[PDB]
């Protein structure tokens, strides 16, 4: 038993990280088959980043202006093109460690593992949720751009995120692997708002079920509620509305615990109104919303 | 910026996990050079585990009674021996993916990454601290034994933990890679006490410095204190005593922030006495003690 925020094993993705340098700017690239993917602001100087015209900047760059380094070795860049906010560098060598992979655009509320890298080398791995406002709460320093987010299913890596920038609130923003930002953001160093960050209600309920599965049961109260009545509570607290789709997704955890989803909703309502009175749930004094129902099921069933 | 619990990249350790089966019992083994390391209770039936005589049980086992599987392939077991609570199986093939490695016995308060595995296959990675009472708060199900804890320095994996059991409190216990338990525990399915779990004071202070580095400063008060006066506070709350060795270890974070260590101690004292009044520090409503000063420095400096 026990319940922990846990990332996927990172080995398949470590084999795909390279270093990309253009002029003075160095960042990380993702090397799959004979293409290296990286954020297009690798072509910017510090001044450019304030207000970049990426088309005009890129037109001054040739293949040989991109230095791509895999460990000790230089890759030869044989072509380049910009797709939305990502740059694709064609190289003369297919990555021999390319795993089976696909590119996915993930939904708000879903989670993924970040392999944080600097200079093409992995530094650590942690789990993030795509928030409903399309930001993530990561840990990123200068040089971390091009670090990627991913999920594993069996032996297929599903890449879903590439890191580009930090917002004034300290949260993080990036694109899918087609270079399209999650959220309303642009890759320019100007102040940008993500708007109200709402709580992923279905995830909090999955985490409460995780707490019950692991013996934490003090917060279970004697009430039930309805969906419409709960959502009137939910929206007062900037929680996302709960739907029958969410109820069904929670079905298996509801069955494991014998706790109806609407019974758990009433338990959540009283936590929202009364707080936790200094108690803890799974070692936290906040309600946690970055575990999906699948995250709870896979952790509590030993999926490999 | 941002601060997250993050594990080391797991790729070097994934290449060392195998499956070990003896009779009906299956668990994980660590394959380095021509030796596989695993918990000795792989030789027990369910009944044996209640009160095992490991010497007598092992004497009924021959090399061919240990099935060791690396992916699809069987390894041939050419010898075996018990070292404390671990079994060493000599195999006829050196692991071609053996990384540079060593075995270390870690100190209470230090952290490490767990690569949780089932059936020889990695399932996820998370960070743990060796608590002062020599338990860890992990996430482990049946079949997870032989999962290992490790740290990376450059390209050397330092293995420090192998998983063996769960205590009645839900915390976890295991050995170093020489098979010696951390703590007073024995590998028998009988109720065992770990005793009072005290808080890793130097780690809480490192985490408060991490909070300041990342812009969280509301808890800084106008007081200072002394070591002896703080430790009178510390011991009332089951915190570990703070020493000049800890002060010096915190030196670099103290310098980064301009906050004297004893000033931060006085800030901690008021948090201990008054609580957090519903505020949060680095997104937590508890004081976090599973980040070492080195963990904070390495995260806040981009070490790879
Ligand atoms: C890519 O490595 C970088 C990641 C920033 C590093 C600071 N924390 C991060 O997540 N991205 C940028 O520097 C980005 C470049 C623009 C052309 C989009 N600019 C940026 O994020 O400005 C915010 C910022 C905050 C704190 C320090 C530096 C920049
Ligand atoms: C090795 O896979 C296993 C790990 C236990 C799995 C339950 N959670 C764990 O961490 N170890 C044992 O089953 C251990 C074997 C003895 C010979 C030491 N026994 C054990 O941990 O008993 C506690 C327990 C708690 C909950 C379920 C099963 C066992
Ligand atoms: Cl665009
Ligand atoms: Cl965490
Ligand atoms: Cl022993
Ligand atoms: K209820
Ligand atoms: K102070
Ligand atoms: Na897209
Ligand atoms: Na030892």
Swiss-Prot record, chains A, B:
Inhibited by pyridone-containing alpha-ketoamides compounds 13a and 13b. In turn, alpha-ketoamide 13b (tert-butyl (1-((S)-1-(((S)-4-(benzylamino)-3,4-dioxo-1-((S)-2-oxopyrrolidin-3-yl)butan-2-yl)amino)-3-cyclopropyl-1-oxopropan-2-yl)-2-oxo-1,2-dihydropyridin-3-yl)carbamate) inhibits SARS-CoV-2 replication in human lung cells. Inhibited ex vivo by michael acceptor inhibitor N3. Inhibited ex vivo by compound 11a and 11b. Residues 1-304 are cytoplasmic. It is found in: Host cytoplasm; Host Golgi apparatus; Host nucleus. Changing residue 132 to H: In strain: Omicron/BA.1, Omicron/BA.2, Omicron/BA.2.12.1, Omicron/BA.2.75, Omicron/BA.4, Omicron/BA.5, Omicron/BQ.1.1, Omicron/XBB.1.5, Omicron/EG.5.1. It catalyses: TSAVLQ-|-SGFRK-NH2 and SGVTFQ-|-GKFKK the two peptides corresponding to the two self-cleavage sites of the SARS 3C-like proteinase are the two most reactive peptide substrates. The enzyme exhibits a strong preference for substrates containing Gln at P1 position and Leu at P2 position. 3CL-PRO exists as monomer and homodimer. Only the homodimer shows catalytic activity. Interacts with host FBXO22; this interaction promotes the proteasomal degradation of nsp5. Cleaves the C-terminus of replicase polyprotein at 11 sites. Recognizes substrates containing the core sequence [ILMVF]-Q-|-[SGACN]. Cleaves and inactivates human TRMT1, preventing tRNA guanine(26)-dimethylation of tRNAs. May cleave human NLRP1 in lung epithelial cells, thereby activating the NLRP1 inflammasome pathway. May cleave human GSDMD, triggering alternative GSDME-mediated epithelial cell death upon activation of the NLRP1 inflammasome, which may enhance the release interleukins 1B, 6, 16 and 18. Also able to bind an ADP-ribose-1''-phosphate (ADRP). This is 3C-like proteinase nsp5. It comes from Severe acute respiratory syndrome coronavirus 2. The lineage of its organism: Viruses, Riboviria, Orthornavirae, Pisuviricota, Pisoniviricetes.
